[PDB]
Amino acid sequence: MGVGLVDCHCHLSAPDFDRDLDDVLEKAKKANVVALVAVAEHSGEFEKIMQLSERYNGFVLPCLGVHPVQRSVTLKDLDVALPIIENYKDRLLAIGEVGLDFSPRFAGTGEQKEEQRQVLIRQIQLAKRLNLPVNVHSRSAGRPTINLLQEQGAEKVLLHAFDGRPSVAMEGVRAGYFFSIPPSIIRSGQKQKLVKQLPLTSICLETDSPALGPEKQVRNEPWNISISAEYIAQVKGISVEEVIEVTTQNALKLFPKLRHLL
Amino acid sequence: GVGLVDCHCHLSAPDFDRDLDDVLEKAKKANVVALVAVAEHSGEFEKIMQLSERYNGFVLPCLGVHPVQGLDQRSVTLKDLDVALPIIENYKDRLLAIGEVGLDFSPRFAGTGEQKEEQRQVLIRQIQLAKRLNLPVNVHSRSAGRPTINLLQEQGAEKVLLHAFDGRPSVAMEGVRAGYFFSIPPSIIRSGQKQKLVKQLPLTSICLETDSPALGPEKQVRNEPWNISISAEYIAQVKGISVEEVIEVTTQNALKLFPKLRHLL
Numbered sequence: 129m130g131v132g133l134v135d136c137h138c139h140l141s142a143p144d145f146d147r148d149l150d151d152v153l154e155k156a157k158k159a160n161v162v163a164l165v166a167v168a169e170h171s172g173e174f175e176k177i178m179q180l181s182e183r184y185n186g187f188v189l190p191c192l193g194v195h196p197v198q199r200s201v202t203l204k205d206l207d208v209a210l211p212i213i214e215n216y217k218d219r220l221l222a223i224g225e226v227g228l229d230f231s232p233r234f235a236g237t238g239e240q241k242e243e244q245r246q247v248l249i250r251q252i253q254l255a256k257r258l259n260l261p262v263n264v265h266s267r268s269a270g271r272p273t274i275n276l277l278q279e280q281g282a283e284k285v286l287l288h289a290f291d292g293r294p295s296v297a298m299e300g301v302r303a304g305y306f307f308s309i310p311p312s313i314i315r316s317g318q319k320q321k322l323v324k325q326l327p328l329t330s331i332c333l334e335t336d337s338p339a340l341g342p343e344k345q346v347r348n349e350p351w352n353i354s355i356s357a358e359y360i361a362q363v364k365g366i367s368v369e370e371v372i373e374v375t376t377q378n379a380l381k382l383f384p385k386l387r388h389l390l
Numbered sequence: 391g392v393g394l395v396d397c398h399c400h401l402s403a404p405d406f407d408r409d410l411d412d413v414l415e416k417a418k419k420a421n422v423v424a425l426v427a428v429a430e431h432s433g434e435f436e437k438i439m440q441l442s443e444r445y446n447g448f449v450l451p452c453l454g455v456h457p458v459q460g461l462d463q464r465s466v467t468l469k470d471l472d473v474a475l476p477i478i479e480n481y482k483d484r485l486l487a488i489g490e491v492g493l494d495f496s497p498r499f500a501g502t503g504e505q506k507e508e509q510r511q512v513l514i515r516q517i518q519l520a521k522r523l524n525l526p527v528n529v530h531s532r533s534a535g536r537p538t539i540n541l542l543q544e545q546g547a548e549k550v551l552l553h554a555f556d557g558r559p560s561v562a563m564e565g566v567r568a569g570y571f572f573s574i575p576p577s578i579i580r581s582g583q584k585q586k587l588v589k590q591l592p593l594t595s596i597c598l599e600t601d602s603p604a605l606g607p608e609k610q611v612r613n614e615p616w617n618i619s620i621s622a623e624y625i626a627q628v629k630g631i632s633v634e635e636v637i638e639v640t641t642q643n644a645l646k647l648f649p650k651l652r653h654l655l
């Protein structure tokens with residue numbers, strides 16, 4: 129009868145959870161959260177993610193990769209990360225937060241934009257070789273990211289917390305890409321216009337814990353995945369159980385290793 | 391869909407003074423169809439009533455005097471209820487229930503037998519007031535589960551909500567047989583006591599609450615009415631049923647417990 133909730137994108141290894149991660153994780157189980165997809169940002173926390181993956185086996189699923197922001201990412205940042213990913217290739221659910229961030233502060237220079245582009249292209253190629261999906265960031269770079277993903281022939285893709293127009297998002301739905309919705313949708317008008325247009329067959333749930341919570345500058349936790357489910361249910365004029373059943377089914381399609389690893 | 395009801399919360403609390411409208415707009419987006427705002431002291435009755443006018447049909451007001459007073463805490467007095475009575479009488483027709491009444495037999499506040507009887511008398515009068523105005527009671531029962539449930543039975547209370555019942559399931563079963571309702575706050579995911587409670591508790595007797603700003607998923611972290619889905623999620627998993635079944639039944643139970651609700655929405 130009852131179905132579980134999947135957090136397709138979160139940062140459990142973040143310094144914000146160092147103090148109470150186990151209490152947070154036990155409470156998430158009680159809050160009907162069946163699986164957590166833990167993503168990486170830098171190579172320095174890959175061991176910590178793989179350690180959480182072993183301690184909470186079948187509940188915390190790992191993702192390793194180098195994020196566009198580190199300062200903009202460099203090829204040198206990806207070089208350090210490649211031997212570690214290769215060592216855990218069989219244990220990963222996806223390539224853990226890769227993408228582009230064309231924010232004025234981080235990437236203003238054309239060289240910085242190409243460095244990001246190069247680091248993403250290699251990780252799309254790495255993912256294709258290891259037969260793994262990509263868990264993607266695209267802040268202020270929605271069309272650049274989607275085009276690059278199409279060009280590189282990415283099959284299983286998650287566009288997490290899509291900070292872009294619905295016309296750009298429609299390019300992704302046609303490309304067969306998935307979109308995760310964080311609980312910050314209840315305070316964000318941009319995320320509101322997005323879900324409106326987005327078909328439920330292409331929607332997944334995320335928190336992006338410790339970020340993108342219901343309140344700005346207040347720590348976000350994986351149990352807030354129900355807030356996302358509630359917002360989508362009301363906006364789509366359907367049952368919350370329908371949202372929970374379809375988004376969890378979408379998570380199983382997007383991440384093919386999930387059904388077995390759960 | 392059906393919508394979620396927060397059967398017990400403190401929107402008038404000083405914790406919400408800065409961003410209440412942002413909190414309430416955010417709660418609407420989070421599929422919260424109704425909020426039942428309760429009182430603690432007469433000094434915030436005007437604030438609760440003004441809020442219910444501003445958010446008409448969404449914020450449902452409850453007025454009453456809580457067993458604990460002050461903000462160093464002390465036990466309630468008959469004088470505290472006397473100041474309240476003229477204000478409740480002025481808003482009798484606009485209220486959904488008598489707003490957080492009950493007993494608190496914590497060692498710090500009601501140690502003395504006289505303090506325990508002062509609380510008992512303040513509650514008894516409010517049950518009498520509620521019976522006259524034909525209103526339900528929204529009840530507190532910290533460390534006084536059986537004393538509250540017996541007193542309510544003795545006084546012949548018809549529509550009762552035992553909010554965040556902190557007592558044993560055997561004591562709670564006395565309430566279900568008496569036809570009383572029990573609201574569950576999102577602190578259930580961190581509280582073992584409330585975990586054994588819902589286990590035994592029939593869903594036909596369960597309601598949802600947050601008790602905002604208190605009893606959140608995290609201790610010493612502000613609780614907001616959108617956390618009512620966390621409560622619904624916990625109950626669904628434990629009962630091995632659909633979250634929509636919990637949302638539909640608890641809202642239906644809220645409409646039975648509060649007879650003015652269907653009309654006031």
Ligand code: NI
Pocket residue numbers: 346347348349608611
């Ligand atoms: Ni927190």
Ligand code: NI
Pocket residue numbers: 343346611612613614
């Ligand atoms: Ni807060």
Ligand SMILES: [Zn+2]
Pocket residue numbers: 264265266288289
């Ligand atoms: Zn991101």
Ligand SMILES: [Zn+2]
Pocket residue numbers: 137138139167225288336
């Ligand atoms: Zn992220």
Ligand SMILES: [Zn+2]
Pocket residue numbers: 529530531553554
């Ligand atoms: Zn209380």
Ligand SMILES: [Zn+2]
Pocket residue numbers: 398399400428490553601
């Ligand atoms: Zn209360």
